[PDB]
Amino acid sequence: EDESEALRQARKDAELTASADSVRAYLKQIGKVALLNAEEEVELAKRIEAGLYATQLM
DNA sequence: CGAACCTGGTCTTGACTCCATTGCCGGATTTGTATTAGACTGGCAGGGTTGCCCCGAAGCGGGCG
Structure with a gap:
């Protein structure tokens, strides 16, 4: 479906790949x-x- | 009988020639860097093939605290 953290866990675990x-x-x-x-x-x-002007003034 | 001679060199002096060799100098070419204001926003891309063997790592059945 689109919720119940099945697709969310799938996207998260596929984000942490090699x-x-x-x-x-x-x-x-x-x-x-x-x-x-x-x-x-x-x-x-x-x-x-x-x-940039602030660090040049300092 | 001596004597000129004539010619190997041995060497020097003086004038002449001639070409390297820097030295500027003026310009030519060569090379490097900076700057372009409408808007533009996450790849194309190419294949998968053996056989055998060794061994090391991932994962799963199976008991255990």
């Missing part, structure tokens, strides 16, 4: 963080420039 091919390992690694939009990019760029 994946001996290094390309598949790196792709499963990078398919983790959430993608962003233009507002998130604006926010992160402003935070980056603020942090």
Whole structure:
């Protein structure tokens, strides 16, 4: 079905596999963080420039 | 009988030639680095074949605390 932790346990146990091919390992690694939009990019760029000026001032 | 001679070299002096050998210098080519603002967001991809043997690891029946 879609619940009762059978499919959930299957997805969890299939997440903790070997994946001996290094390309598949790196792709499963990078398919983790959430993608962003233009507002998130604006926010992160402003935070980056603020942090850079703050550490240069320090 | 002596005497010129003539010619092996042995060697030097002086002028001449000629080509390496750096040295700038001006320009040519060669090589390296930086920068491009619309938006773009998790692979293609190729095969699976023997026989025999040894041995080491995974997993399952079976009793035990």
